Design a protein around this ligand. Structure first.
Ligand SMILES: CCCCCCCCCCCC(=O)SCCNC(=O)CCNC(=O)[C@H](O)C(C)(C)COP(=O)(O)O
Lengths: 88, 115, 208, 379, 112
């Protein structure tokens, strides 16, 4: 158990990298507080695809009930940290 | 008025949730379908075709119709996963042999009498 | 009534009428109509909500014991608000008798599955769903049984065309069987056979 | 626990097996779905008759008879006595044909393959009977909703008698090859055992009932035509397995010989279709001499007869079980709806429960004992 | 006593009179909870009382089989259990109540 603990800085970096690899959001427009619907022009299906990208990047499952409220990368990071039990 | 018996969903939100679940399942399955059937398409265009087939019915505003569509889509997914379809059934979604049909007024005038 | 006319049986007619009134009295929540035809066939017209109770009664009551499900099918009548009528044919071996139960539904109203009453219903319901598009609730596994994989539509509907919408051939460019819009070298010849001068006065409808 | 797809009469079978045992067996059908019931709505009743030849194509005249009985009931007419006797005689000949095919195909699939030839010679002789009466060997279209198409030729009864008096020895050779053989018994005994209550609830009929001890036969409980005028016995099983069903089928062949003998001796004289020219076509000489006969011939062969509105469910004891038709008439010369009930449908639906806890080599035996033809199953 | 009733899966019952009495008394007990005006209750009570008196007035088994018109007392017991199950389910369903709703105006009009 000598592996370094996961930190919200690393969480944000990973989430932003998966956003960058998503080909419908250009890197120059996305921010941690950007909103999927109006700030980026995405509908529900792109949001679902982003959620599955999160699921297979962070190696766990996200129920649909709480997956429909994550609308910005910041609260995605919040949800990951809450399910991950990190401090900083 | 006009009280009707539900199929699965009491309103539009439950139907949308079922639609999202079905879409997630199809999106997960597409790469397995591409590999297992030895198709000549990419995963990207397979998922694009899935998205197009979902968007074909995006105008429906009736929960009974929506969850009947979801039942049919689940039937199709079960047919694909269990490899009950052949490669021909999977490839029928793309119409690679059908000749392109012009939507222009002049072209349809030239070819025949069909509007 | 000389040798060319079918003979009629009054005893069976009376017995079936009596059993129809008996069934209607026992289950007034679901029975809307009872009929006995001139060739001694008893049918019971019920509300859709009573598919499971009525059938269960007819299977389990000591005075009915209709233990065999001979056939389950549907009929499409486009002119009705409820398009499809569902017909159950039941055979009783104890009393050597047959009965028919009818109910109705439309394209969007589910019908309860009767597999828990008769195991034979399973495939029949699948066939109905395959050919008419009637959904059965609580079916163990509802899916197509007669049509090709990925076939669109329900061919036993009246508005479905006889030759369908697609045909199949082998293509050598893509080296597989492909489906294309149907083209017939000879169109099916539609015949107008019905004559004027009605045949049966006993079935004449009021001129409204 | 692996999965096997035994695909391509023609059947696809998807099964899960753990070791040698069969855990689950789902048949996939539709490889012979021709859309017969939709096609029938575009035909007159006479035009629709030949489809029943192709429904269960091992027993043609029996399906013909069932359809004809349904139309007769809707028309409120009755066939003449001689037509009824001819119908029952050819129905028993057809039962012999079907039972030969079923038993010898079962044995061939198991691996015997000699009685197949031995009895297909007899099958060829009965095909000769079919051709002499109708001009066709199998798709006969002989039994019509008014009786039969034509009277028998002048020497047919003698040849039917000559054939039927030697058939018992052929059955005896069959039994000598199969009945007491230890390999056949080991392949058939205690295989596909079904209880009486399960058979009733699963919609089984015919032998699939009588093998489990159920005393039911439609020619005895709900007789049609002249059946109530002939005597015969109903073979009944005791263990409800494949071996008892095989014994029952052999015994029904013998009882069919008995009924055929009775039919040969009591064939009555007279006409062979109903003397009602608004239903049955007139004779050619009458058509060519009389005005009413010409008009009725013209109208019957162009428009067809109108059937009064109504719905019937008519069933017969076909060689494979209860064969039924739900026929709906709207008053015109074309049927509004025709639903065909085939016993093989329910039998194949019950195949899954019949093959629980058996070997892979037993599924073939269960399929053979179910007597499945996919023309009637798919329609 | 006999063996092999003749139907596969139907075992021979020793002492079928006591089984029949117990089943009929259970059926009457269940029917007691149904409203008196219900046709199902009165019809089934009539049938059950008839059969109970028949089995209480006959010690012989073959003569009882002939008199009950069912034959093979084992399937008579099976039918009694089926009736008990139906009585419980029908108490749950309460189908003596008036009709749920009428069909549309021309739902059953044939032809057309
Ligand atoms: C490889 C080949 C694969 C084949 C693909 C098979 C396709 C299966 C068939 C598809 C099943 C259906 O039609 S599912 C029926 C479709 N659902 C609806 O129409 C409901 C109302 N419309 C909406 O909710 C939105 O337009 C919508 C964009 C849909 C949601 O996006 P948002 O809520 O964010 O807004």
């Amino acid at each position: 158990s000598d592996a370094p603990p996961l930190t919200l800085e690393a969480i944000k970096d990973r989430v932003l990298y998966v956003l960058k690899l998503y080909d419908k959001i250009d890197p120059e427009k996305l921010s941690v507080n950007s909103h999927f619907m109006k700030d980026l022009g995405l509908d529900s299906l792109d949001q679902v695809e982003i959620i599955m990208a999160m699921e297979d990047e962070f190696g766990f499952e996200i129920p649909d009930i709480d997956a429909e409220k994550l609308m910005c990368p910041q609260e995605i990071v919040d949800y990951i940290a809450d399910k991950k039990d990190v401090y900083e | 008025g006009t009280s009707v018996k539900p199929i699965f969903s009491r309103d539009m939100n439950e139907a949308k949730r079922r639609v999202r679940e079905l879409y997630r399942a199809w999106y997960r399955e597409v790469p397995n379908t591409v590999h297992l059937f030895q198709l000549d398409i990419s995963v990207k265009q397979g998922r694009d075709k899935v998205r197009e087939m979902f968007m074909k019915n995006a105008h429906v505003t009736d929960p009974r119709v929506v969850d009947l569509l979801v039942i049919k889509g689940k039937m199709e997914l079960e047919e694909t996963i269990n490899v009950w379809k052949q490669r021909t059934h999977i490839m029928r979604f793309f119409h690679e042999t059908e000749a392109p049909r012009p939507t222009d007024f002049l072209s349809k005038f030239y070819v025949g009498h069909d509007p | 009534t000389r040798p060319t006319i079918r003979p009629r049986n009054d005893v069976v007619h009376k017995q079936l009428s009596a059993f129809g009134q008996y069934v209607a009295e026992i289950l007034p929540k679901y029975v809307q109509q009872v009929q006995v035809s001139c060739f001694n066939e008893l049918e019971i017209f019920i509300h859709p909500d009573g598919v499971i109770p009525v059938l269960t009664f007819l299977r389990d009551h000591t005075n009915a014991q209709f233990k065999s499900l001979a056939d389950l099918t549907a009929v499409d009548v486009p002119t009705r608000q409820n398009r499809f009528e569902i017909v159950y044919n039941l055979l009783s071996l104890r009393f050597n008798s047959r009965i028919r139960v009818k109910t109705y539904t439309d394209e969007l109203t589910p019908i309860e599955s009767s597999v828990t009453v008769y195991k034979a219903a399973n495939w029949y319901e699948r066939e109905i769903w395959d050919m008419f598009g009637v959904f059965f609730a609580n079916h163990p596994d509802l899916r197509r049984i007669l049509t090709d994989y990925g076939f669109e539509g329900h061919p036993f509907r009246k508005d479905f065309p006889l030759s369908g919408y697609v045909e199949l051939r082998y293509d050598d460019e893509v080296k597989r069987v492909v489906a294309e819009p149907v083209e017939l070298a000879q169109e099916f010849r539609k015949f107008d056979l019905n004559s004027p001068w009605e045949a049966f006065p006993a079935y004449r409808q009021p001129p409204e | 626990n692996l999965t096997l797809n035994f695909g391509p009469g023609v059947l696809r079978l998807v099964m899960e097996l753990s070791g040698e045992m069969v855990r689950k067996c789902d048949p996939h059908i539709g490889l012979l779905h021709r859309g017969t019931e939709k096609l029938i709505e575009y035909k007159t009743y006479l035009q629709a008759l030949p489809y029943f030849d192709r429904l269960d194509y091992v027993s043609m005249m029996c399906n013909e008879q069932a359809y004809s009985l349904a139309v007769e009931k809707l028309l409120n007419i009755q066939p003449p006595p001689r037509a009824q006797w001819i119908r029952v005689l050819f129905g028993e000949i057809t039962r012999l044909l079907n039972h030969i095919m079923a038993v010898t195909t079962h044995a061939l699939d198991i691996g015997a393959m000699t009685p197949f030839f031995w009895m297909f010679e007899e099958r060829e002789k009965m095909f000769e009977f079919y051709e002499r009466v109708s001009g066709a060997r199998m798709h006969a279209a002989y039994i019509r909703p008014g009786g039969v198409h034509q009277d028998l030729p002048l020497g047919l009864l003698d040849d039917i008698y000559e054939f039927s008096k030697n058939f018992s020895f052929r059955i005896d050779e069959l039994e000598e090859m199969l009945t007491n053989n230890r390999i056949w018994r080991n392949r058939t005994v205690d295989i596909g055992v079904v209880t009486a209550e399960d058979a009733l609830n699963y919609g089984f009929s015919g032998v699939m009932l009588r093998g489990s001890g159920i005393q039911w036969d439609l020619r005895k409980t709900q007789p049609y035509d002249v059946y109530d005028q002939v005597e015969f016995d109903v073979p009944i099983g005791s263990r409800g397995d494949c071996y008892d069903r095989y014994l029952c089928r052999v015994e029904e062949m013998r009882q069919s010989l008995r009924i055929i003998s009775q039919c040969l001796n009591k064939m009555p004289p007279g006409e062979i279709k109903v003397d009602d020219a608004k239903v049955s076509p007139p004779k050619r000489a009458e058509m060519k001499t009389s005005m009413e006969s010409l008009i009725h011939h013209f109208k019957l062969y162009t428009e067809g007869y109108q059937v009064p509105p109504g719905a019937t469910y008519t069933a017969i004891e076909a060689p494979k079980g209860e064969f039924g038709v739900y026929l709906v008439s709207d008053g015109s010369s074309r049927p509004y709806r025709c639903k065909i009930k085939a016993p093989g449908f329910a039998h194949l639906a019950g195949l899954d429960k019949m093959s629980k806890g058996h070997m892979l080599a037993d599924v073939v035996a269960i399929i053979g004992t179910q007597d499945i033809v996919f023309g009637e199953v798919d329609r | 006593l006999k063996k092999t009733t003749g139907l596969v899966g139907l075992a021979v019952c020793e002492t079928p009179h006591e089984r029949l009495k117990i089943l009929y008394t259970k059926i009457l007990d269940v029917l007691g909870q149904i409203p008196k005006n219900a046709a199902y209750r009165k019809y089934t009570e009539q049938i059950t009382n008839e059969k109970l008196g028949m089995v209480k007035a006959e010690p012989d088994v073959k003569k009882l089989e002939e008199q009950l018109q069912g034959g093979q007392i084992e399937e008579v017991i099976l039918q009694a259990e089926n009736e008990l199950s139906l009585a419980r389910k029908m108490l749950r369903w309460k189908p003596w109540e008036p009709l749920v709703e009428e069909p549309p105006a021309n739902q059953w009009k044939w032809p057309i």
